Design an enzyme around this catalytic site. Structure first.
Site: not given
Ligand SMILES: CCCc1c(F)c(F)c(S(N)(=O)=O)c(F)c1F
Ligand SMILES: [Zn+2]
Ligand SMILES: CCCc1c(F)c(F)c(S(N)(=O)=O)c(F)c1F
Ligand SMILES: OC[C@H]1O[C@@H](O)[C@H](O)[C@@H](O)[C@@H]1O
Length: 257
Positions: A61, A91, A93, A103, A116, A195-196
């Site tokens: 992703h 990570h 986007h 986002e 993020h 957001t995922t």
């Molecule tokens: C699924 C758990 C890991 C994970 C997060 F904790 C997280 F906060 C975000 S996000 N875009 O909201 O920053 C992610 F994309 C993500 F993959």
């Molecule tokens: Zn994110």
């Protein structure tokens, strides 16, 4: 499984994750005129001096830079937050072209990418328990625009050739996330979600107003990653962003007058 394409992307996620249509979903458009200065916000404290990065992973992703979170080595405190939140990973986007990729949006403007930095509330003991709590996570979001190169990003860019495909990882020790921050810590904040998938509504969002600048060459290297695994037909890892979701019964607060 879920992804970002036409057949498995954001408009499909609700079928397996019905919270996708929930009351505090992220991201959102930040209407800067409607956001209100909040004098009750305490000073924000980003304490990354002792951060211990470990590894970088292409998860199909995005790519995650992972940290040692077995101690309070890198923590976010203050601002809207009650207590201490520990950095677990960052990570990005990003888009297929510079005109999209973020986002969050700012008065509907899309940035080229969004960083993020994900933190969990230490009162809950582990990330897994934190994502069972309304105040389990804090994500620090930073917009990227294309202009001058960001020197502190280059080590990330240069390792991506070694994690091109889903499931690949590489050692990534001694990386300093302080080199990804802008000068100002002015921010907007609101309650939201991952957001995922699984889209859990656990997040206090803290979105910095000042974007960082990265070079075209740097973001072009993000766009050479692959969503697919090794040996499979190439699907470039681009447009891995969820669009803005309904604000519903929320207010965005500003840290700055
Ligand atoms: C699924 C758990 C890991 C994970 C997060 F904790 C997280 F906060 C975000 S996000 N875009 O909201 O920053 C992610 F994309 C993500 F993959
Ligand atoms: Zn994110
Ligand atoms: C096939 C297939 C889908 F069509 C789909 F919509 C999703 S979803 N709701 O997670 O995006 C999948 F996980 C999936 F495997
Ligand atoms: O009732 C007045 C209050 O309304 C709320 O929606 C706002 O967030 C507060 O800043 C304001 O003082």
């Amino acid at each position: 499984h879920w992804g970002y394409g036409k057949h498995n992307g954001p408009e499909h996620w609700h079928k397996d994750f019905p919270i996708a249509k929930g009351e505090r979903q992220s991201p959102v458009d930040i209407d800067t005129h409607t956001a209100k200065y909040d004098p009750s916000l305490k000073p924000l404290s980003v304490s990354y001096d002792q951060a211990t990065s470990l590894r970088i992973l292409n998860n199909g992703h995005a790519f995650n830079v992972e940290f040692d979170d077995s101690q309070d080595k890198a923590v976010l405190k203050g601002g809207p937050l009650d207590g201490t939140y520990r950095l677990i990973q960052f990570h990005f986007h990003w888009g297929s072209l510079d005109g999209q990729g973020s986002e969050h949006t700012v008065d509907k403007k899309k940035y080229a990418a969004e960083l993020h930095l994900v933190h969990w509330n230490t009162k809950y003991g582990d990330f897994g328990k934190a994502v069972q709590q309304p105040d389990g996570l804090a994500v620090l979001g930073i917009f990227l625009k294309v202009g001058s190169a960001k020197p502190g990003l280059q080590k990330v860019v240069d390792v991506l050739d070694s994690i091109k495909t889903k499931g690949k990882s590489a050692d990534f020790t001694n990386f300093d996330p302080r080199g990804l921050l802008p000068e100002s810590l002015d921010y907007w904040t609101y309650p939201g979600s991952l957001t995922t998938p699984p889209l859990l509504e656990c997040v206090t969002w803290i979105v910095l107003k000042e974007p960082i600048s990265v070079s075209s060459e740097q973001v072009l290297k993000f766009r050479k990653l692959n969503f697919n695994g090794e040996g499979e037909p190439e699907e470039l890892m681009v447009d891995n962003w969820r669009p803005a979701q309904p604000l519903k019964n929320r207010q965005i607060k500003a840290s700055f007058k």
